[PDB]
Structure 1
Amino acid sequence: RTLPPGVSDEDFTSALTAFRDVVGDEFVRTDEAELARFHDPYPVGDADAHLASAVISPRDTEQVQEVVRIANRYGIPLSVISTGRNNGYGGSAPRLSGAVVVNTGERMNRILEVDEKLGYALLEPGVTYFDLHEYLEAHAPSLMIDCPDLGWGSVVGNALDRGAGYTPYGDHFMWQTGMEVVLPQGDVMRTGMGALPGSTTWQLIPYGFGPYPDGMFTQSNLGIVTKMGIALMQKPPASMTYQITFENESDLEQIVDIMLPLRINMAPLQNVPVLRNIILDAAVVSQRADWYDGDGPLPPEAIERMKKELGLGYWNFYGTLYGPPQLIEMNYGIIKDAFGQIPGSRFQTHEERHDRGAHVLQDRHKINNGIPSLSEMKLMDWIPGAGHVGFSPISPPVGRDAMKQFRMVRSRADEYAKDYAAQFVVGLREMHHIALLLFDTQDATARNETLALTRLLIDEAAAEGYGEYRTHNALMDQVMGTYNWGDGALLKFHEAIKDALDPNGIIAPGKSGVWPARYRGKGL
């Protein structure tokens, strides 16, 4: 029977009774079958590495406060999910093996308010991108969401891991405006203009008076968020999504050097531009066995056959334009003239391409217009038992940097028998190299290779000045370990704050490599 680390069987028994006393017997789950459902679907070490001793589903903020006070009395570590779809990063599994999961989304799933004219929502953690989309379509249709690739996730949960989508509102944390958060001893506070009783401005300026705290509750174990505002973009009168195929893997250098100047003023590249490699593109519409059934990495001719058969390039650029059709045509004209400088470049609009090769173009057209999709999950049919882990370091948006990363990562992936399926994304002045490391979750050796590969990718990226932005449970200590300027000054700052707000070491111990005193230097 899974016990939290540092808690007696007796104290665990007492805590479970006390948790039932608050939420209801139905909303305290300890059965193996219910716990298996909170397994990381894509484990990278074993699979037994990150387990839940129980799952607690509180009704409301008041119950969140009382379960936190119960956790403090008995020393129960509690991890936190909204919808727990953090796939690539641990799913709903706790960093600290044996933690009790607080499932905020199961019962706290309400859209609390939507203001059409001032363009915001006040949300609970269980609101999915699908939910909010449905609500806006029915009640505030001038507005649109910003969704990541999948959209079964939480508008709150994603923003709290500082996730992103691809509309002009792609930076989810940026557009987060106000929070209600239960602090680690069970106090509740509202951030920004929400701290003023009867304020009408909670969701329209992120800051308020005095120190601005919301960031400290993102990629964080300093609190359980119970309500979160997010600004919502107005739908433009029209939109158009385009694909640019590029023949040569060596085109990346020129593609990135043209992309930056076109994106840094947020026009003409109006949304978040993505450059996807042939694999990430082929894997939505095809399986690995279709191109190659031998051992070792995919050979060049397998790649070449994907390019030809699907009508794609090694690099496939996807962008959306917004506004009156006269502006779209004009901006698209600047785009075509700029990227057309690259020999072999081919341009296709969402209304010009409707074949196997255009599946991603059509899916990008939905996502870039805030229409949530599960199409990218077909990527997990690439190989049997496929799972993925995320690798997404930050770089300067310069071709030389891109080329360096492309080469470093692919070379290592080839060595570790993992396909190079990646994309380069430019936000405004920063670049992300997002590689989806795919592997057989059911094959212990493949799990071990993926973990070994990712640890190597992180160290080598970091030696080059490229820091990881978001990572898996299994990798959090190592990633925080790379941010060790001032003999680990950042982590010492985080620990000082954690130990002050959380003297009993309760909330999601080890999140972002931040351990409270009672668990740190115990190797878990």
Structure 2
Amino acid sequence: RTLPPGVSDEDFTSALTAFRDVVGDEFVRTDEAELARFHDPYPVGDADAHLASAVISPRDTEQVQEVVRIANRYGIPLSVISTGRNNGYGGSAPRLSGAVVVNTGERMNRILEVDEKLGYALLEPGVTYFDLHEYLEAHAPSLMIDCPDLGWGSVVGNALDRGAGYTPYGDHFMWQTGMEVVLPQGDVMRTGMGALPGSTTWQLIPYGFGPYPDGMFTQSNLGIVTKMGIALMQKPPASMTYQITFENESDLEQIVDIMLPLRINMAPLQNVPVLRNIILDAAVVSQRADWYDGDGPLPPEAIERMKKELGLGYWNFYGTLYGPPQLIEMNYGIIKDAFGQIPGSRFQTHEERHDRGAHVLQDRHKINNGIPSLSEMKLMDWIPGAGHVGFSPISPPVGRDAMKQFRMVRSRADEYAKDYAAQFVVGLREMHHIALLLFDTQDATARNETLALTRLLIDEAAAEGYGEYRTHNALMDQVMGTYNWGDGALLKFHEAIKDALDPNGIIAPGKSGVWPARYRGKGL
């Protein structure tokens, strides 16, 4: 029977009883089948590395407080999910193996408020992107969400890992406005203007008075968020999504150097521009075996067959334009004139192209207009048992930096027997190299190779000044270890805050490499 680390069977028994007294017997799950459902679907290294001892589903903020106070009394470590679809980063699995999972989204799943005129929602953790889209279309259809690729995620949970989408409102944390949070000893607090009783402005400005704390609850184990505000963009009068195909792998340098000046003023590149390689686009509409059934890396001529059969480039640019038809036409003209300076570039609109090679184009047109989707899960049919682990370092949005990263990552992927499927994304002034490292989750050797490759990719990127933005449970200590300016000053700061707020070391120990004192330096 899975026990949390540093808890006796006796204290675990006492805590489960107390949890049942709070949430109800139905909402304290310890059965083999429910615990298996909380396994990381895409484990790197050991499949058994991140297990839950129990899953608690609180009804509301007051029950979250009581479950946290019980955990404090019995030294129970509590991990936290909203919807628990953090696939690529551990899914619903706790960083600390044997933690009890607080399933906030099962019962705290209400849209509490939508203000259509002022453009905001107040949300509980269980509200999915699908839920919020459905609600806006029924009750506030002038508004749209900003969603990641997969709509089954949590508007709250994704913002709390500083996830992102692709409309002008793509930076989820930026548009997050106000939160309610249960602190690690059970006290509850509202941030920003919500700390003023009876305020009318909680969702209108993210800062209140005094030190601005909401960022400290993202990629964080400093509290359990029970409500979160988010600003919501008005739908424009019209939109159009376009695909630019680029024939040559070497076109990356010029694509990025044209992209940055067109994106830094948020026009004419009005949404978050994405540049997807052939594998990332092909894998949505085909399986690897369709192009190559041999051992080793995909041969060049399999890559060319994908490009030609699907009418795709090595690099495939997707952007969206918003406004009156006349502004869309004007902006599209500027984009076509600029990227058209690259020989071999081909431009196609979401109205022009409807073949198998336009599947991603039509999916980006949904996502870029706040219409959530699960079409991207077709990636995970590329090979049997496919899983992915996130690798997504930040770099300058400079073509020379893109080429260096393209070459560095692809050459290591070939060496570690993994396909190079990646995109370059420019937020505003920063570039992400988001590599989807696909591996057979059922093959111990493939799982171990994938962990080893990703550790190497993190270290080599850090050695060029490219830090990881977000990572899996298995990689959190390594990645925080790369942010070690001033003899590890940042982690020392985080540890001081962690121990002050969480003296009993309860909340998601080891999240982002930040361990409370009782678990620190134990190698788990």
Same-fold call, TM > 0.5? yes
Task: For residue 46 of structure 1, report the CA deviation from its aligned partner.
Answer: 1.1
Task: For residue 413 of structure 1, report the CA deviation from its aligned partner.
Answer: 0.2
Task: For residue 63 of structure 1, report the CA deviation from its aligned partner.
Answer: 0.2
Task: For residue 108 of structure 1, report the CA deviation from its aligned partner.
Answer: 0.1
Cα-to-partner distance string for 1:247-290 (whole Å, 9 max, x where unaligned): 00000000000000000000000000000000000000000000
Question: In 1, Cα distance between the equivalents of 2:449 and 2:266?
Answer: 39
Task: For residue 156 of structure 1, report the CA deviation from its aligned partner.
Answer: 0.1
Question: In 1, Cα distance between the equivalents of 2:27 and 2:297?
Answer: 47
Partner SS for 2:318: strand
Task: For residue 427 of structure 1, report the CA deviation from its aligned partner.
Answer: 0.5
Task: For residue 158 of structure 1, report the CA deviation from its aligned partner.
Answer: 0.1
Question: In 1, Cα distance between the equivalents of 2:523 and 2:428?
Answer: 39
Task: For residue 45 of structure 1, report the CA deviation from its aligned partner.
Answer: 1.3
Partner SS for 2:131: helix
Question: In 1, Cα distance between the equivalents of 2:286 and 2:33?
Answer: 33
Instruction: Give the corresponding residue for 1:374.
Output: 374
Question: In 1, Cα distance between the equivalents of 2:370 and 2:198?
Answer: 31
Partner SS for 2:497: helix
Task: For residue 71 of structure 1, report the CA deviation from its aligned partner.
Answer: 0.1
Partner SS for 1:63: helix
Cα-to-partner distance string for 1:124-180 (whole Å, 9 max, x where unaligned): 000000000000000000000000000100000000000000000000000000000
Counterparts of residues 147-162 of structure 1 (less than 5 Å): 147-162=147-162
Task: For residue 353 of structure 1, report the CA deviation from its aligned partner.
Answer: 0.2
Cα-to-partner distance string for 1:425-470 (whole Å, 9 max, x where unaligned): 0000000000000000000000000000000000000000000000
Question: In 2, Cα distance between the equivalents of 1:61 and 1:415?
Answer: 49
Question: In 2, Cα distance between the equivalents of 1:159 and 1:143?
Answer: 19
Cα-to-partner distance string for 1:60-100 (whole Å, 9 max, x where unaligned): 00000000000000000000000000000000000000000
Question: In 1, Cα distance between the equivalents of 2:38 and 2:133?
Answer: 26
Instruction: Give the corresponding residue for 1:416.
Output: 416
Instruction: Give the corresponding residue for 2:251.
Output: 251
Cα-to-partner distance string for 1:100-135 (whole Å, 9 max, x where unaligned): 000000000000000000000000000000000000
Question: In 2, Cα distance between the equivalents of 1:498 and 1:150?
Answer: 32
Partner SS for 2:517: coil
**Which portions of structure 1, spanning 4 or more consecutive aligned residues, are displaced by more than 3 angstroms?**
none
Cα-to-partner distance string for 1:299-339 (whole Å, 9 max, x where unaligned): 00000000000000000000000000000000000000000
Question: In 2, Cα distance between the equivalents of 1:354 and 1:131?
Answer: 28
Question: In 2, Cα distance between the equivalents of 1:68 and 1:238?
Answer: 47
In the alignment, structure 2 segments of 5+ residues that lack a partner are none
In the alignment, structure 1 segments of 5+ residues that lack a partner are none
1:199 aligns with 2:199: yes
Question: In 2, Cα distance between the equivalents of 1:130 and 1:305?
Answer: 36
Question: In 2, Cα distance between the equivalents of 1:197 and 1:131?
Answer: 29
Partner SS for 2:284: helix
Task: For residue 232 of structure 1, report the CA deviation from its aligned partner.
Answer: 0.0
Cα-to-partner distance string for 1:182-240 (whole Å, 9 max, x where unaligned): 00000000000000000010001000000000000000000000000000000000000
Partner SS for 1:448: helix
Question: In 2, Cα distance between the equivalents of 1:469 and 1:428?
Answer: 15
Question: In 1, Cα distance between the equivalents of 2:308 and 2:378?
Answer: 21
Between the aligned residues of both structures, percent identity stands at 100
1:499 aligns with 2:510: no
Question: In 2, Cα distance between the equivalents of 1:34 and 1:379?
Answer: 26
Cα-to-partner distance string for 1:459-513 (whole Å, 9 max, x where unaligned): 0000000000000000000000000001000000000000000000000000000
Q: TM-score with structure 2 length normalisation?
A: 1.00
Partner SS for 2:487: helix
Partner SS for 2:348: strand
Task: For residue 18 of structure 1, report the CA deviation from its aligned partner.
Answer: 0.3
Question: In 2, Cα distance between the equivalents of 1:209 and 1:197?
Answer: 14
Partner SS for 1:250: helix
Question: In 2, Cα distance between the equivalents of 1:45 and 1:222?
Answer: 28
Task: For residue 379 of structure 1, report the CA deviation from its aligned partner.
Answer: 0.3
Task: For residue 411 of structure 1, report the CA deviation from its aligned partner.
Answer: 0.2
Cα-to-partner distance string for 1:349-395 (whole Å, 9 max, x where unaligned): 00000000000000000000000000000000000000000000000
Partner SS for 1:318: strand
Question: In 2, Cα distance between the equivalents of 1:66 and 1:345?
Answer: 59
Question: In 2, Cα distance between the equivalents of 1:311 and 1:172?
Answer: 33
Question: In 2, Cα distance between the equivalents of 1:346 and 1:508?
Answer: 48
Cα-to-partner distance string for 1:28-83 (whole Å, 9 max, x where unaligned): 00001110000000000111000000000000000000000000000000000000
Partner SS for 1:518: helix
Partner SS for 1:387: strand
Q: TM-score with structure 1 length normalisation?
A: 1.00
Question: In 1, Cα distance between the equivalents of 2:377 and 2:430?
Answer: 27
Question: In 2, Cα distance between the equivalents of 1:314 and 1:348?
Answer: 16
Question: In 1, Cα distance between the equivalents of 2:297 and 2:453?
Answer: 14
1:322 aligns with 2:315: no
Partner SS for 2:89: coil
Question: In 1, Cα distance between the equivalents of 2:204 and 2:160?
Answer: 18
Question: In 1, Cα distance between the equivalents of 2:45 and 2:97?
Answer: 13
Question: In 1, Cα distance between the equivalents of 2:42 and 2:83?
Answer: 16
Partner SS for 2:226: strand
Question: In 1, Cα distance between the equivalents of 2:103 and 2:343?
Answer: 52
Counterparts of residues 208-219 of structure 1 (less than 5 Å): 208-219=208-219
Question: In 1, Cα distance between the equivalents of 2:370 and 2:420?
Answer: 28
Question: In 2, Cα distance between the equivalents of 1:388 and 1:402?
Answer: 22
Question: In 2, Cα distance between the equivalents of 1:66 and 1:476?
Answer: 29
Question: In 1, Cα distance between the equivalents of 2:199 and 2:47?
Answer: 47
Instruction: Give the corresponding residue for 1:102.
Output: 102
Question: In 1, Cα distance between the equivalents of 2:215 and 2:238?
Answer: 34
Question: In 1, Cα distance between the equivalents of 2:448 and 2:480?
Answer: 21
